[PDB]
């Protein structure tokens, strides 16, 4: 059979929180079969756990909620876990947010490869899209399409000098195109206008050219840090791979995003969950 995977070893990472600007400790540990990805606030007492589930989501990133208790910026870590097929793992946080690291999945990918993958004696469960499912917000569109594989297609028209007047598009088929090589290290575009507001208000303190391609009203300041052609939509695809993993199992199917973000990504997932005939669970031999 195709088996569930966890981590072979505990691994620890230190970074800055995206919003605090303050040091935060992350520990990844193996978990049992059928656990999924479970976030732990160990700084609290009693420790509070929040499963990585669509229904546990509550702006510019994906936040998990249980009560007043939250875990911020889950999208990149969940994307690394999606990309390497990690089914089951505990995520312990010293604080309310995942460290932003280089601001891609690359750091998490590398810590998980370094931990090692452990097969478990239990069938890996897949969510296979049977029939099309879609959500719209003004011009924003997310859509699930039946497909023999996993495929994420992203298109956005952002009205900035940087894009030279052109819609940004990227497809990724994870039969030919590797998550690790072609999406995992992509950083988002930060717009001085947006960052300037937040920093004034003591928010997004941790965000810089270390964890973002920073663009002013005109130009990418830090072209030196570009890793890919069409990096922005490649990071959007990374964001969506992370958000889609809140389904709790790998997707067999195609995702199409048009101006979509975390908000619509979560609406799509719910809408699919609601639509029991749009999907079935499969395992393989
Ligand atoms: N997932 C989201 C959206 O892609 C994300 O990657 N946000 C993000 C990443 C790094 C820095 C950052 O701060 C800022 F704003 F200053 F750039 C925001
Ligand atoms: Zn992101």
∠ CA 266-227-26, nearest 5°, is: 55
Omega of the bond leading into 46 within 30 degrees of 0 (cis): yes
Q: What is the Cα–Cα distance from 214 to 237, expressed in whole angstroms?
A: 19
- What is the three-class DSSP state of 133? strand
Provide the H-helix boundaries in 22-157.
Answer: 75-83, 106-115
Q: Which atom of ligand 1 is nearest to the CA of 236?
A: 4
Q: How far is CA 8 from the centre of its chain?
A: 22
Q: Return the H-helix or E-strand segment holding 68.
A: none
Q: Which of 183, 189, 185 is nearest to 222 (CA)?
A: 189
Query: Long-range contact list for 136-141, CB < 8 A, 24+ apart?
Result: 137/263, 137/264, 137/267, 139/258, 139/259, 140/258, 140/259, 140/260, 140/261, 140/264, 141/256, 141/257, 141/258, 141/259, 141/260, 141/264
- Ligand 2 mean position to 60 CA, how many Å? 9
Residue nearest to atom 4 of ligand 1 (CA): 188
Specify whether the CB–CB gap between 118 and 30 falls below 8 A: yes
- State both tokens at 2: 């195709």
Distances (CA, A) of 110 to 43, 62, 173, 183: 25, 22, 21, 14
- Ligand 2 mean position to 268 CA, how many Å? 18
Specify whether the CB–CB gap between 255 and 244 falls below 8 A: yes
Residue nearest to atom 1 of ligand 1 (CA): 61
- Ligand 2 mean position to 103 CA, how many Å? 7
Method: X-ray
| Resolution of the structure, angstroms | 2.2
Ligand nearest to the CA of 100: 1
């Amino acid at each position: 059979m195709i088996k569930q995977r966890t981590l072979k070893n505990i691994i620890r990472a230190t970074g800055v929180g995206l919003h605090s600007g303050e040091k935060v400790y992350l520990t990844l540990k193996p978990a049992p079969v059928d656990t999924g990805i479970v976030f732990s606030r160990t700084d609290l007492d009693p420790v509070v756990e929040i499963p990585a589930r669509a229904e546990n989501v509550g702006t510019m990133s994906t936040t998990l909620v249980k009560g007043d208790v939250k875990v911020d910026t889950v999208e990149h870590l969940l994307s690394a876990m999606a990309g390497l097929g990690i089914d089951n793992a505990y995520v312990e946080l010293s604080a309310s947010e995942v460290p932003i690291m280089d601001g891609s999945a690359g750091p998490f990918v590398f810590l998980i490869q370094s931990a090692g993958l452990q097969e478990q004696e239990a069938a890996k469960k897949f969510i296979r899209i049977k029939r099309e499912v879609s959500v719209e917000e003004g011009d924003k569109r997310a859509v699930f399409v039946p497909f023999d594989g996993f495929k994420v297609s992203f298109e956005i028209d952002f009205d900035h000098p940087v894009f030279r007047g052109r819609t940004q598009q990227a497809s990724v088929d994870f039969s030919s195109t590797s998550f690790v090589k072609e999406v995992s290290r992509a950083r988002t575009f930060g717009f001085m206008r947006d960052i300037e507001y937040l920093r004034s208000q003591n928010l997004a303190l941790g965000g810089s050219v270390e964890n973002a391609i920073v663009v002013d009203e005109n130009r990418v300041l830090n072209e030196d840090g570009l890793r890919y052609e069409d990096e922005f939509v490649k990071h959007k695809i990374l964001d969506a791979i992370g958000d889609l993993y809140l389904l709790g199992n790998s997707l067999i199917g195609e995702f199409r995003g048009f101006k979509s973000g975390h908000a619509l990504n979560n609406q799509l997932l719910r809408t699919l969950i609601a639509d029991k005939d749009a999907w079935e669970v499969v395992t393989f031999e």
